[PDB]
Design a protein around this ligand. Structure first.
Ligand SMILES: N[C@@H](CCC(=O)O)C(=O)O
Length: 297
């Protein structure tokens, strides 16, 4: 318990939080000199800013946001100043853009969001970035919305449940508690996001891939949902030593069975081979060593 590691995540009812919490517990149980804890946050942007500032040693973040940060481009949060202090540890699972709408709000498509009260994501979230890009693909801006609300997942579904919001965006792994919870109490529907419309701007944002949310994933949503997704990644500060990261990797990913128990998305989508597939930023030296020894690299 000599070296402290705080892992930035997201809303407590998202997927980043339980994954980070599980990862922290697993590394702590390994007794390798690391004392880890997860911290709820606004998401990808907030997490990357925290790692750069030296506040967090690790964090979960979307591959697209990590790329923009490392390159100092593409989104207002990082344009003009690259964040070269972040390194990738592993690609984890697909993060799907969920566009949730109350059935009584007159919303069947993204275009219908015009004049509506929409939760666009949390402050410092990756979700907000995707929402802004997707809305533009449909000819809209936050100003065209009735209200552009930035709150946590728990606050967001509360607004939806009390009818103070009409729709909500959430770039998150399938099965997020926040969405499951909302589906059980409120009549909701998932709005589609056309990949082709997105493809029209794929040159600016190349990380989107087509993704179908299986019918029955959430209560009351029995039809499949055609949308888009990016990739969740575990990242770390370049400042962490190779030895520390290497020990961490063996304690967390070295125990694959234990790791997959952390969340259904890991059991369903995680694999060491895919963990190093199409990474947007450089792997941390400690992770490279782990993957080389595992035969993955
Ligand atoms: N990818 C989302 C967070 C999703 C989650 O918390 O599971 C974001 O960066 O805003």
């Amino acid at each position: 318990a000599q070296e402290f590691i705080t892992i930035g995540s997201g809303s407590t009812t998202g997927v980043y939080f339980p994954v980070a919490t599980g990862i922290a517990k697993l590394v702590n149980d390994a007794n390798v000199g690391i004392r880890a804890n997860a911290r709820s946050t606004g998401g990808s942007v907030a997490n990357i800013n925290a790692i750069n500032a030296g506040e967090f040693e690790m964090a979960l973040a979307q591959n697209d946001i990590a790329y923009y940060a490392y390159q100092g481009c593409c989104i207002p949060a990082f344009e003009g100043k690259p964040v070269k202090t972040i390194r990738a540890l592993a690609a984890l699972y697909p993060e799907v853009v969920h566009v949730v709408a109350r059935k009584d709000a007159g919303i069947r498509t993204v275009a219908d969001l015009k004049g509506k009260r929409v939760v666009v994501g949390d402050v410092g979230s990756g979700t907000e970035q995707n929402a802004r890009q997707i809305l533009e693909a449909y000819g809209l801006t936050f100003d065209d919305l009735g209200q552009a609300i930035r709150v946590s997942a728990s606050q967001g579904i509360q607004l939806m449940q009390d009818k103070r919001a009409d729709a909500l965006f959430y770039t998150v792994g399938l099965g997020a508690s926040a969405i499951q919870q909302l589906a059980l109490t409120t009549p909701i529907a998932l709005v589609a996001v056309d990949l082709n419309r997105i493809q029209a701007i794929a040159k600016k944002y190349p990380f989107y891939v087509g993704f179908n949310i299986p019918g029955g994933t959430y209560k009351g949503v029995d039809v499949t949902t055609p949308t888009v997704a990016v990739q969740a990644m575990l990242i770390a500060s370049e400042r962490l030593s190779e030895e520390t990261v290497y020990k961490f990797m063996k304690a967390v990913f070295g125990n694959l069975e234990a790791f997959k128990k952390i969340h259904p998305n890991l059991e369903r989508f995680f694999g060491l081979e895919k963990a190093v597939k199409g990474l947007p930023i450089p792997l941390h030296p400690g992770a490279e060593r782990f993957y080389k020894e595992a035969g993955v690299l």
